Design a protein around this nucleic acid. Structure first.
Lengths: 82, 120, 90, 120, 81, 85
DNA sequence: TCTTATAAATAGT
DNA sequence: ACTATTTATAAG
DNA sequence: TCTTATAAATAGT
DNA sequence: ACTATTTATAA
């Protein structure tokens, strides 16, 4: 069904939904990275404090350390206001 | 009542006048040979002190430039090391000919942490 | 969409531009869903073909990145070539 | 930090030892030329005083024997006078060739008076 | 006349008797001086304090000054005795 | 006569007697007329015999202190006086 | 400078 | 690890 | 050392 | 100053 944007109170449902939407999120980043020839980095820390990262890593992060211009950065509250 | 007294007695004081200025001649030659010796000693002491000084000055200057070279040996070592760690960013940045370059991080975390904390 | 186009570089500029914008915003929405539904902190960095920066953070960009600089444990890291080597398994 | 100081500084005190005894050499030759002059003046003063005294002593003794000869000239004068009046007693005593001798007295009264007053 | 041995209180008798006995005394001295070859001196002061002397003078007085021996000496009291 | 007695004893005894008598006439003149008389006699043998009226030393000392003209006689004056008889 | 055919992704059965 | 709904995605 | 003849000396008439 | 007394000296 169409679920609401709220914390999954269950543990197992939140676990497998985390895995499936994580892999799908990497896939959408894979499609954007190849179709438009863009470099993408994605860092994810779960509720269990384990690292899950994706790179289209050292090159993208090092680029970000060498760019001090105004640019679009979004947040969860900005997604709600969008 | 003088037989020859008025001549011999008037000759005595004329004799001890010569005696007394003979003494002044001696005492004045003694003062000038004392001062001529002191000027002689003073130049010898000044020559040897000039010797001792021109040895200390060159010893302390070469020790000064020793400290200077030690500062260059330190700053040059640290400048070459602070760019030696920045050369390690190039072997990770551009290419490893695409072997397995884009995976994870190990040393760029230090550069990322330093760039984030510079947000002021 | 209407018909599936292949996973190939869009040689056109405008199609690659508008597709970049739409798929970018949708990518941030799928990340918004996962960030809130499962209570996870997510950082996303995107450099286009024109080398312009577009980023997204779940809670705080500097706090998440600074966390990432302080984690030295084995973990799952993936790449585009790893997605290719994973999806074509049937 | 000792290069050559430990030799040149050990040479400094050896230098001013020679200087200091050179100073004593000077002051000692000064003492002996002062005393040699004072002995020279002392002999010259003694020779001239020997001259002045040997003139006074012989002027005073020849003046002394002048007084001594003046006493002889007086005692001889008085002895010749005290016998000159006694020679006058002989021209009255013995003989006038018996011209008119035995009359009266004129100077035998003095001899008679002196002979009478000696009655003691 | 005979007279006693006393001062003649008269002036004229004492005067002329003085003269005559004086000249007689010189005569006795003259006779002794020549008869016995002896030298004699006589000195007489009168009552009028004038000198009358006789010599057989300078020679006899000078002899008297040169004689210091014991000798016979007579005086008026010795003549009485 | 008044001539030298060539004999010794006659000249001796005559000397003594005429001497004593000469002192007697002098004694009379000294007392009678109050005059001072001094007599000195040396014999032929050079022996002293003297006579004084009052004091020998006082009369002689008086005589030494009198320098006026006065009568003085001698043997030759007696001869030149007695040979006027 | 955007509005509807079809993939594209996801939650219970 | 799956069928029946949502959700995007691409050319008019 | 002596005792009596004569000069020797002197005083009033 | 002469004529008596009185001393004074050699037998």
């Amino acid at each position: 069904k169409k679920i609401q944007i709220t914390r999954i109170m269950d543990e197992r449902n939140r676990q497998v939904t985390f895995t499936k939407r994580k892999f799908g999120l990497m896939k959408k980043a894979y499609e954007l990275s190849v179709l438009c020839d863009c470099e993408i980095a994605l860092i994810i820390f779960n509720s269990s404090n384990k690292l899950f990262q994706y790179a289209s890593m050292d090159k993208v992060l090092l680029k970000y350390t060498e760019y001090n211009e105004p640019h679009e950065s979004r947040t969860n509250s900005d997604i709600v206001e969008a | 009542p003088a037989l020859r007294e008025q001549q011999l007695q008037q000759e005595l004081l004329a004799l001890k006048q010569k005696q007394q200025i003979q003494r002044q001649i001696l005492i004045a030659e003694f003062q000038r040979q004392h001062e001529q010796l002191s000027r002689q000693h003073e130049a010898q002491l000044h020559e040897h002190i000039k010797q001792q000084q021109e040895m200390l000055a060159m010893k302390h200057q070469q020790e000064l430039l020793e400290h200077q070279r030690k500062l260059e040996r330190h700053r040059q070592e640290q400048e070459l090391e602070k760019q030696h760690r920045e050369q390690k960013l190039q072997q990770l940045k551009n290419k490893e000919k695409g072997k397995e370059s884009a995976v994870a991080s190990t040393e760029v975390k230090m550069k990322l942490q330093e760039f984030v904390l510079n947000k002021k």
